[PDB]
């Protein structure tokens, strides 16, 4: 009660309705986490159905991660990486990331989050073309329904228009093309080609894509989509940036999302699950040719970086986090439990009247709600079906998040990679019960 | 030796010359820190003369900060603050920050760093005017020689042109006016007025200033400067944003830098010393009227925020960090040891031939080098005097940083707030010996 009033007075939340906060107070005040579970201050326990924010990949309560952070903080919590200063944790983490990326992605620039990483990637690809002598190759192409963060550049690279309306556009040379959502590869790829030709490939620096569009509703591309993308980018001399902020570190049943489509990007950004959210960290990995151009032509000080780039404690936590993912076979577990969740939720679809698509790639998936799945009739937006299911799930002990941009009704699912079959079974049953409740309240 | 080669191959550093890295390897590889000291992998020990990056304010090796992080990471390392979800650490930290800011600055938006904070502040002031019905009040005014970070907006708000040349300008509605460096208050304030009138106050959202320009060379404004600034901002209906990223949390001998000038900003950003760099954290504090406008007119979800906004572990570390600053009287110690360092370095000035200005406000200060201090003749830039002093300091066991933008030669000084008088004495003597060595090599 005191915590609720203090929150209202003093804490302006990210991605929260301030008017809701003032009227109702915090929806929930979390206190403790353990494995896939979170407990609030009233003692009620929940399954953390999207891993908090698609990031607590190894689960809550990891004594080993706490110990790895405490050991480095006693030893040397922070040291500068500026002016070529370095330290062993960042070096070892960079070497480790290079050992687990796609072939040729061996050089890492560190940050503290996903927005920082994507803003850095925009600046790095523009820097790359400028030192190449092509200062006109400047524009960033990205997808509708994409989400790339909300620092000033990534706010406009983000393809969901709600994010532009908070402050307006601050960036300039950005272009949004059609997504593969409910589209063929040829349609999506031709939209990219048409925009490239309207703009002229000599003005374009890079194409950014999430392997699986996360905030857009877990949009999983056709099997040939990124093969084409990679061929188009090659043909026009455009850099392909893969945004692995959600899909990285085992989330889709591969170490990185893009491996599902057998394509190597020029650049990759990451954050979130690299530390299972225990410590803010992100970064940008670049290909060998790009690193070589940097070495040859990036003269003097590289005028970009963050105080906390390469933070030794972040790096110590990330190293232990990656070792856990390897030792517990969490990449493989993510693929098998994603299959198990998809199989179960398909059965649930057949028990209900209002479930449309059910899709997963590893432990990254989604359940669409529709007035008539067989004809693909959606609910009108004013019924707010997916948010109602979120609320019913919440009351039944499951935290999920919904996506309704542009008249969709999508329940997102992405539990921690440690989840087991017993737990998948209960999660599926609760999802059934919550959709059934809303299905019933709708007459 | 293996660490040096791995660093070259895999780690692209912030604000480092990649070509230097490839040719010479990391200048230093740090291993351990304790209090004001750092030790590298060869066993050589250094005084951390700028607190690593103006941020390790309570010193290295704090077992209490390690323990505070480990306790929260075992309990609940991360939980979302989106959708009005909350948790006790962020609530308590927000309440704590509100207890120590200038009067009326009671509501906090959290981030993970200084660039994130300033990009958020740009977006928040633009949001504020848009919901006020003035979508044209958009432009951000800032100072030459300022540094506000290098996310996409803060890259252009930053007033030092080197930062623009890495990727070019990405932002649009920015304006740079003359700094108070070697200037009168009336000159600096009239430059601000002239630009406001050329642009028209109806197009201007905000004026950003560091209380003390840090990366610009520790530029300390005249005593009346911010009084005038605050009157000009009031007169034109412009928001005054104080960038406390360096000057916050005791650095200048006050809790916040702006208190030295008896002025309350509309908005304040912070990072760095809030956790003494033990855990990435930053934020934006807004005045009561602004919070009230948000409450009344910021409809629906606030479409801004970072995954790690309000990170529970960051907040637990920051709380203990602030309690240390209070219990060890570090704000007062910073003022007294700044006075002691200024007094000592003035004596050193009189023993040497090439020291110009010596200035401090608390433990934030600078020592200028000049060919002829009495007539104010500078060294030509091609002599690189200040960087040579940096190197000589380094070899004598002191890490400082230099500022040479626009033909200056400035040694920056900002040791952790725990430094004691014995330590100030040794630091002063080493500074004397290093400037004397370069003074001598220059014939
Ligand atoms: C795909 C993607 N990229 C970037 C971001 C931004 O990351 P952060 O919130 O750490 O700045 C997000 C956050 O959800 C994301 O989902
Ligand atoms: C005054 C000021 N503002 C902002 C920043 C950027 O902070 P960060 O490096 O955490 O993004 C800096 C960093 O030195 C700074 O000195
Ligand atoms: Cl392990
Ligand atoms: Cl204490």
Residue numbers in the entry:
A (entry chain A), B (entry chain A): 2 to 444
Give the article text.
In order to investigate the structural bases that govern the improved solubility of the heterologously expressed T16F mutant, the 3D structure of VbTA T16F was solved at 2 Å resolution by X-ray crystallography. Electron density was evident for residues 2 to 444 with no gaps. One molecule of PLP was bound at the active site, although it does not form a covalent aldimine bond with the catalytic lysine residue (K273), as seen in the crystal structures of many other PLP-dependent enzymes. In agreement with the majority of class III TAs, VbTA T16F forms a dimer, generated between VbTA T16F chain A and its symmetry-related monomer (180° rotation). Dimerisation covers an interaction surface area of 5463 A2, involving 103 residues from each monomer and 48 hydrogen bonds (as calculated using PDBsum). F16 is located in a critical position, at the center of the 14-residue loop, connecting α1 to α2 of subdomain 2. This loop clasps between α11 (domain 1) and α12 (domain 2) of the opposing monomer, locking the dimer together. F16 has a clear role in stabilising the dimer interface, making 26 contacts (<4 Å) with main- and side- chain atoms from six residues in the opposing monomer, including three hydrogen bonds with the carbonyl oxygen atoms of L303 (3.4 Å) and H305 (2.97 Å), and the nitrogen atom of the α-amine group of S84 (2.84 Å). Such interactions result in the stabilisation of a second loop (residues 298–313) that contributes to the active site. The correct positioning of this loop is essential as it houses the highly conserved residue T308 that binds PLP via two hydrogen bonds between the phosphate oxygen atom (O2P) of PLP and the main chain amide nitrogen atom (length 2.78 Å) and side chain hydroxyl atom (length 2.64 Å) of T308.
